[PDB]
Amino acid sequence: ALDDIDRILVRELAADGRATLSELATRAGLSVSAVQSRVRRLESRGVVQGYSARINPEAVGHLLSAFVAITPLDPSQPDDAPARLEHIEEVESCYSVATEESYVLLVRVASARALEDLLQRIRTTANVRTRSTIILNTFYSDRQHIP
Amino acid sequence: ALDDIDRILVRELAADGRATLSELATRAGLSVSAVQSRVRRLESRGVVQGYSARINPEAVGHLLSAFVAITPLDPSQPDDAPARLEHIEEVESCYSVATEESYVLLVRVASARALEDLLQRIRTTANVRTRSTIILNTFYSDRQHIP
Amino acid sequence: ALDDIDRILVRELAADGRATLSELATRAGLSVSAVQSRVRRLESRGVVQGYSARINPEAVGHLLSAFVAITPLDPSQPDDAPARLEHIEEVESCYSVATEESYVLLVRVASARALEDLLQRIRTTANVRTRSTIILNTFYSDRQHIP
Amino acid sequence: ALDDIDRILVRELAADGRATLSELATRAGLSVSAVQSRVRRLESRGVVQGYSARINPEAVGHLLSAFVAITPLDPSQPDDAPARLEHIEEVESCYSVATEESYVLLVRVASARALEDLLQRIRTTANVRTRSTIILNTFYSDRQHIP
Amino acid sequence: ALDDIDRILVRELAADGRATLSELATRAGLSVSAVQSRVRRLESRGVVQGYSARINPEAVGHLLSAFVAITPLDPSQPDDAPARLEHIEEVESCYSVATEESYVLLVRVASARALEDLLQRIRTTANVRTRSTIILNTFYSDRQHIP
Amino acid sequence: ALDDIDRILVRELAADGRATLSELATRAGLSVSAVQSRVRRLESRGVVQGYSARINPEAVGHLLSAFVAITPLDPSQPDDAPARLEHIEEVESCYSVATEESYVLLVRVASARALEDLLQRIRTTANVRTRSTIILNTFYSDRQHIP
Amino acid sequence: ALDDIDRILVRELAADGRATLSELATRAGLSVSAVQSRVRRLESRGVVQGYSARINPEAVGHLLSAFVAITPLDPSQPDDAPARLEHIEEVESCYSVATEESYVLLVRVASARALEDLLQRIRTTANVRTRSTIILNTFYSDRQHIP
Amino acid sequence: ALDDIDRILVRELAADGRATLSELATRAGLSVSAVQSRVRRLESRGVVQGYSARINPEAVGHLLSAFVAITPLDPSQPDDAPARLEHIEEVESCYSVATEESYVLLVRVASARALEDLLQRIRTTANVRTRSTIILNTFYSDRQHIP
Hints:
The structure is a homooctamer.
Chain A: H1 4-15, H2 21-28, H3 34-44, E1 48-55, E2 64-72, H4 81-85, E3 91-97, E4 103-109, H5 112-125, E5 128-140
Antiparallel strand pairs in A: 2-4, 2-5, 3-4
Organism (chains A, B, C, D, E, F, G, H): Mycobacterium tuberculosis (strain CDC 1551 / Oshkosh)
Pfam family, one (chains A, B, C, D, E, F, G, H): HTH_24
GO cellular component, one term (chains A, B, C, D, E, F, G, H): cytosol
C-alpha cells in the first residue's frame, strides 16, 4: 500500500519541497504532529529520497545539454560503465536501456567544444562508443506524477 | 552574474532543498536576512526553478519508464507538441532535440498495457510518430553539478 | 593569366588585409605607385572582393555554430532557398552541394535553444527539411591558399 | 566585456577591414588615439583574429571546392588530425563536429583529378576515412553578423 | 562471321585508325581493292562503328571527370533516360547496368562548380537520382582487345 | 590556349578520325599545307593521342562487359594495382576514383563464366577485393565533347 | 514407406533416365516384368515425374543465367506472381522463399542486354520489384540424392 | 552449330527424355539411324548432358530445401569450394555468383535438425560463412526453354 493520505503528502511535496510541516496539515486534514510522522516514515521507507531545488542549468554556465548513448566495446570485460563514470560530474543521469545502445546519460557542459572533450573522456574512461543527441530546449522538466 | 556566495547557495540547495536559512547563512558567512535576499533573487532571475521531493517512481506504482522520441506527421505547420502534451500527466519531461526526431519525452506508467495506451494518446494528441526505448534500470539520476 | 607579381600581392593581402600600400612594395619589388594600381585592377577584375577583419564568434555572443543541410520539400516549386534565406542574418554562408541534401548553410546562434528556433524559421521560410551538424570547435578558419 | 563602442568597431572592421582609424574615430565619436587603443585591445583579447582580403577562389585557379568529413581509422588514440593536416595548404578550414564523423574540412583544388589526389593525401596523413561533398555554387559566404 | 583476314584488319584499325589501305593490304596479303571491300563490309555489318582521334580531355579544358550512376524516380514508366540525355553534350557514355542502379554515365566538365550544375541538369532531364564518383586519375583507357 | 581553329579541327577529327587532310581544309577555312601543320603540333603537344576505329565488342566475341571496382587489401604494401593489371588484356580501362573503392576497371569477356575467372585472376594478381557491375547494353560510347 | 527395392530403382533412374527396363533388373535383383510394374506404380504415386535429358544452356544460346528475386509491390492485391509469369518461357524455375524477398526465379537469356528486357517485363507483368544475381558458372546441377 | 533438326531433338528430349528413337525420327522426318547419330553428336559436344527421372524430393524424405550462399573465410587462396563440397551428397547444385557472396548452393535435407548439421559440415569442409534461405514451396522448376 501507500494510504491515500500518504499520497496527498507526496503530491504536495513533489509540487513544493519547501511546503511547511504547518501548511501541509491544512490541505491534508491532520495535525503538525501527525503530518510530521508520516513524512519521516516516507523518508525511511525509500519513498521521498531528498529535497532539491531545481536549478536552471544555463544560469550556472551549462549552455549545452546532450543525451549521450553508450555501448561497451568489449563484452569479455565486466560491464561496469555507470560505476566507472560516476566521478565524472558532468554526467547528471545514467540509465540502462533496452534499444540499440546499453546506457543513456544526460550530460551538461559549457559549450560545443567542451562536449567534444567530455565525449573523449567518456570513451577512454568507461570503455565505450558514444552517440550524442543535443538538447535545444527544455520545455518542462521533472513533473512527477503521483497516480 | 553569479558570484561566489550565490554559487555556494545553489550547491547547498541542490544537495538539500530544505536547507533552512540559518544553516545556509552560517555556511556562506552571511546573515539570515542577507541569505533570504540572495535566495529570492536566485528565484526571480532564472536560477532556482523550484524545489521538489525526489520521489521513488516505483514506490508510487510507476513500474515502467520509457524514453519516447516523437516526430510530427506534418512538419510544415508550426509545431505545437510540448504545449499539447503538457496536459498528459504521465509525461515527466519534454526536450526538443537535434537530429532526426524532434522531441524526446520521458514517460512513466504502471505496466506494459498502460504504455501502449499512452503511446496512442501521444500519437493522437500531438499528431506524431513515436519511437520508444524502455528503461530497464536507473543507476543514478539528477546528479546536478555546479561548476 | 594572373602575372606572378599579382600573385605575390594576393598572398600578402590574404595573410594581412591591413598591410600598407607602402610595406607591400618592399616584399613585392615595385613602387608605391606601381603596387597601388595592380591592387585597383585586382579589385575591378573580381579577384579581391573585400577586406574583412576576422571576428571571433564566441566573443560577440555566438556560442553555437552549426552546418545546416537543407533540401526543398516540393520540387514543383522554384528552387530559390538561397534568396529566400538571405535576410536571415544568422546564416553566414550558403552553398549548393552535390550529395544527399541540396544546400549547406553555416549558421551561428546564441545557444542550443536559439538553434531550435532558427531551424523552424529556416523550414517555414524556405520550404525545406533541415539536418544539422553542431560545430564543437574551429581549429582554423579561412587560410586562403594562393597556388 | 564588449561595450557599445567596441561593438561599433567590430561591425565596421567586419564590413571594411581597411577602415582607417580616422574613419573609425569619427564613426564612434572618439579620438584616433582612443580608437587605436580599443582596436589593439580587441586584437590582444580574443575578438579580432586578423584581417584578410576576401579573394575569388576561381580567379586564382581553384575551380573545385568540396566539404570533406573525416573520421579516424583508430579513434582510441588521442586525436591528431587538425595538427597533422595543417600543413596541407589546400585545406582552408577545419572544424570538429558532433554526430558520426569527427571533422569537417573545406578544401579547394584546381580539378577533379587534383581532388582525388588530395583525398589520398588526407587519408594518409591523418589516417582517416573521407566522405566528400562537391560544392556546385557559392551563393554568399562569410556574412559575419554582429548582434 | 569474322575470318582471319577480317581479324587482322580490325586489330590494325584499332591500333591505328588512319592506317591507309595500301598499308593494310600489304599487311593482310590482299590487294588494295580487296581491303577496301572487306573494310566497307566491316563498317556496314556491326563491326567497325566509326573512327576517332583519341583526344586529351585535359588539353581541351575538361579537368574533372566523373561516373554517375542514375536511377529513375518512377521506374514503372518505360524508361527514357539515354534518349533524353543524349542531347546533354558533356555526357560521353551511357550504359545500362545490372544491380541497384539503372545506368552509369561518364561525364566530363571544366570544374567542381560545373559538375554540380550538370548533376541538376541530369536529375531534371531524366527524372533520376544520381550517385557520383569523381575520377582522380586515368591510368590507361580504351585498350581494345581483339581475341 | 587552343586557338579556335585548332578547336574546329579537334571536333572534326573526334567525329571522324579518317577525315582527310584535304576535306578538313574546306570546313576549317585553311590550306592542305596549313591544316597539316596544326595537326602535327596537336599530336606533339599531347592533344590528339591516337586514332582508333571503334570496334563493336560483341562482333569480336566479347559478349559480357562489366565495371569491376577494386580496393587493395593490404595498405602496408605499395598501391600499384594499375601497373600490376596492365598485362591483363581484358582490362580495357583503369581509373582511380573517389568513392567506396579505389579503382574502377572496364573489362570485356567471352561469357559469365569467363568473368568469374577474370575476377579471381584480378584478385590474386593485384592484391584486391572485387565488386562487379554487369553492363547490359551500350547506348552510346565515346562521344567526345569539345566545348 | 518406399520399399528399398523401389529406392534402388529411383537412384538408378535419377542417375540414368535412359537405363533400360532390361539392365535395371540385374542391378535391382528382379524380373523385366517385376521391374516394369514398380516403375509404373512409382509414376502413378507422384514419385518420378518425368524423364528429361539435361541440356547445356550455353549450347542452345543461353549465355547468361541469373537468379532473380522478386517481391510484390502491392500487398492489397492477390499474390499470384508464379501464375502470372508462367507464360514467360525464360523463367526456368520459380520458388517461394523465406528471406528478404518472396520468390526466387532462375532465368536464362541470350545476353546482358536481353536480361535487362526480361527484368522490365517481369516487373510490369507480375507486379514486382526485382533483384538479380548473375550466374558465372554451373559446377554441377541436379545431382538428386536418394537417402 | 545447332540446325533446325538438332533444335527439334533437344526440345523433344527436354519434354520427354525417354522419347524412343522411332518417335524422334518420325517427328524430325529422319531415319532412326540418322536420329541416333544426331543424338550421339549432341551428347559428345556440349549439348545434352545426361538424362534424369525428375524425382519428388518429398516422396523420398527430403522435406526441407534451402538456398545457401557461401563466402570463403580467406578469399586470397585460389578457391576450392565446389570440388570440396562435391562429395557432400545433399548438395544438389553449385553456382558461382556475382555480388557479395561467392557461391549459391541448393541443398535438401530431412528436417530442421538435419539442416543445422549440414550447415556445420559446409562451413567446415569449404571453410566458408553461410547465409541460408529456406524454400517454403516450389511452384514450378526445371522448365527448360529451347529458343
